[PDB]
């Protein structure tokens, strides 16, 4: 029905039957990687382009409009990607973010899932303009998953992820959750985040 979409990063697969497409962020592709700031010593690690999971929050009926839960995308990763962060000085990668909020079609409300570069705590008034960033909505009547793909962007061509987090996954309540007698009491929100086009540069000494 074109509503079934399968995303396959690395050897991991995520299939959704209520897709509304993919939002391609600020660019449909990556910029140039072999810049003059790495002297050609950058290399690509394809073993880190996999899906990893994280719990965001429990969307309940008490949360009003403007409730923001954030997740700085370079996070405490326990797999190959975290090993790369601990073993290389400089790194760059885009993100492929899927956010799932599974209730049932008898619930109301709407979540705004957005990727914000260089996140700063938004004031109350600024939350009304949060759609300026790459985003999708999640509404139980229509879809259970939002899928956003963003490139690497920042001041520097390579970042030190222990000093700077370019991206932040912002989920905000737009309309409060509505629950009837037959709907879900609450909706738990999870993420499938996959680094894309991972490049590393600068080999660090062994940690003892």
């Amino acid at each position, epitope marked *: 029905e074109d509503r079934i979409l399968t995303t396959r990063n690395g050897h991991t697969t995520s299939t959704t039957q209520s897709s509304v497409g993919v939002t391609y962020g600020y660019s449909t592709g990556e910029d140039h990687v072999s810049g003059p700031n790495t002297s050609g010593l950058e290399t690509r690690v394809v073993q880190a382009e996999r899906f990893f999971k994280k719990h965001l929050f429990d969307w309940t009926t*008490d949360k009003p409009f403007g*409730h923001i839960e954030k997740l700085e995308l370079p996070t405490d990763h326990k797999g190959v990607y975290g090993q790369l962060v601990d073993s290389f000085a400089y790194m760059r990668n885009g993100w492929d973010v899927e956010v799932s909020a599974v209730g049932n079609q008898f619930n109301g409300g709407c979540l705004l899932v957005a990727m914000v570069p260089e996140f700063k705590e938004f004031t109350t008034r600024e939350k009304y303009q949060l759609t300026l960033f790459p985003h999708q909505f999640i509404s139980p009547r229509t879809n259970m998953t939002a899928h956003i793909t963003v490139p690497y962007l920042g001041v520097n061509r390579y970042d030190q992820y222990n000093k700077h987090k370019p991206w932040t996954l912002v989920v905000m309540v737009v309309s409060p959750l509505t629950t009837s007698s037959i709907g879900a*009491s609450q909706i738990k929100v999870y993420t499938n985040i996959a680094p894309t086009h991972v490049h590393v540069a600068g080999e660090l000494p062994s940690k003892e």
Partner: antibody
Amino acid sequence: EEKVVESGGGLVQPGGSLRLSCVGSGFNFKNYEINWVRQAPGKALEWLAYITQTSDFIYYADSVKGRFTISRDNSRNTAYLQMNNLRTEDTARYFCTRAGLTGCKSRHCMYVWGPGAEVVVSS
Amino acid sequence: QTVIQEPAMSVSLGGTVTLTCGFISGSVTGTNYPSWFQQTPGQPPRLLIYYANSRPTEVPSRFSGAISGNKAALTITGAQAEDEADYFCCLYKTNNNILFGGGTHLTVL
């Protein structure tokens, strides 16, 4: 070990003002929500106030609206509950609680509880 | 007041007891997000049940919760000697009001 330690209690006269501190350790204090619950001796628990992770939303119980003010300092890992115009019925054991656990991320968790600060208000 | 909870219940050692928590007027559902706490004297309350179905990992599997008969229910299977305490029922009703139960003083015989 995620634990919450609170102090600042004592004996004050009615109509006075005091501030209760709430120092948390073992967790990122900025990533969790703080609830204040008081329990009078021989009575049940009573929820007083609630503050979010960035002070975006603040809620007070209908019986303590206006008199009490809640604030938090994420840098110092400390939560504050300022009480003004204390009444004779405010004598209770005040608890500073952290809302949130592994499978529960909302205000309905109420997982970590402090030892409790004794506040006695009498003439 | 608002929330009705049994003042005290008696259960034999190793037995099964069910506690009742509900409203004076209305039905308790998942939207109220029932929570249960255990408080031995001289001790801070301990969380037992949240969302009326889940149990913290540290809490033993003896304590279980459910919604039955439009009221929040806490079930203890195979009561031990450490289950004698005050059990409180927490219910959500609007953001500015959080309701606590009267408190059941469970006594293990």
